[PDB]
Design a protein around this ligand. Structure first.
Ligand SMILES: O=C(NCc1cccc(-c2cn3c(n2)CCC3)c1)c1ccccc1
Length: 304
């Protein structure tokens, strides 16, 4: 079986490269962040522009939703994260502590915590309600490219240009695992599978790998796309067929069969690197976004 994703809407409005798009957990909204220092909110189903959220002093590299879909956190080159109340647009808290660009962020499922990763090579864990940093983890020896909580928030996974993926105990901050295969090219993205059994890791040798974390072994490898320079988001698609989804430096969205690792679709339309993809939580919808020469977000829909 293959999906049949087809372009439905193109969302224009950012005036510089888009950085990261994310669907709200309740399925109603898409948030985007950009090098233009703005967050924008769009309807998930119709692509209709809703509102702009502003306040960072420099470009934004990542954005993430709270579990109740009411808050956003953003990660900026201005070395801060901000927590936003989406309905009012108010910045609730500015999270200060990183000493260089903040590149990646996420809420835990309970959404009482935020995890962040930075060019300062650290991973930080923040309290949402106080805005204070609870822990600084000496996570890596190069910039941190991604951070993600597992399904019950007990674990954090991080990746770095140092070629490592590491698993952290949220409560204690201790490093539980370092994953390394036969080589250690820069790791440009990582996230847990929905069931929390696996980890999907991208490396800058045009490769994605599915790891059994607990046993510390690689199970699957996905190739055919181009990824040697940029930190591109990747996803598990689980609403229909079971796919791996990623952007690519040849301006396409790639979709693989998770099991057989074969490419099942390549989505054409963007005019620059597809830096970010996201999968809708209940419908077969993909959002994609591209860098400076394109500036648009695209919504694609499949019947399976
Ligand atoms: O990937 C890069 N730039 C493209 C870009 C721009 C804005 C956001 C992102 C981004 C954020 N996150 C990711 N990519 C993966 C997980 C979090 C990348 C990059 C920038 C400086 C040195 C090495 C690589």
């Amino acid at each position: 079986v293959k999906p049949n994703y087809a372009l439905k809407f193109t969302l224009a409005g950012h005036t510089k490269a888009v950085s990261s798009v994310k669907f709200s957990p309740n399925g109603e909204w898409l948030a985007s962040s950009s090098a233009d220092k703005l967050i924008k909110i769009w309807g998930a189903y119709d692509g209709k522009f809703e509102k702009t959220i502003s306040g960072h002093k420099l470009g934004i590299s990542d954005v993430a939703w709270s579990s109740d879909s009411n808050l956003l956190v953003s990660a900026s080159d201005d070395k801060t994260l901000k927590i936003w109340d989406v309905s009012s647009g108010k910045c609730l808290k500015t999270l200060k502590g990183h000493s260089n660009y903040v590149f990646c962020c996420n809420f835990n499922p309970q959404s009482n915590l935020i995890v962040s990763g930075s060019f300062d090579e650290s991973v930080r864990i923040w309290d949402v309600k106080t805005g204070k940093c609870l822990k600084t983890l000496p996570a890596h020896s190069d910039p941190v490219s991604a951070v993600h909580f597992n399904r019950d928030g007990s674990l954090i996974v991080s990746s770095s240009y140092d070629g490592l993926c590491r698993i952290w105990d949220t409560a204690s901050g201790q490093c539980l695992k370092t994953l390394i295969d036969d080589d250690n090219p820069p790791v440009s993205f990582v996230k847990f599978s929905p069931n929390g059994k696996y980890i999907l890791a991208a490396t800058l040798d045009n490769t994605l790998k599915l790891w059994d974390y607990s046993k510390g072994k690689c199970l699957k490898t996905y190739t055919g796309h181009k990824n040697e320079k940029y930190c591109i988001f990747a996803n598990f698609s689980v609403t229909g067929g079971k796919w791996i989804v990623s952007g690519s430096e040849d301006n396409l969205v790639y979709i693989w069969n998770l099991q057989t690792k074969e490419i099942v679709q390549k989505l054409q339309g963007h005019t620059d690197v597809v830096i970010s993809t996201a999968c809708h939580p209940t419908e077969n919808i993909i959002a994609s976004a591209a860098l400076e020469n394109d500036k648009t977000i695209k919504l694609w829909k499949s019947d399976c």
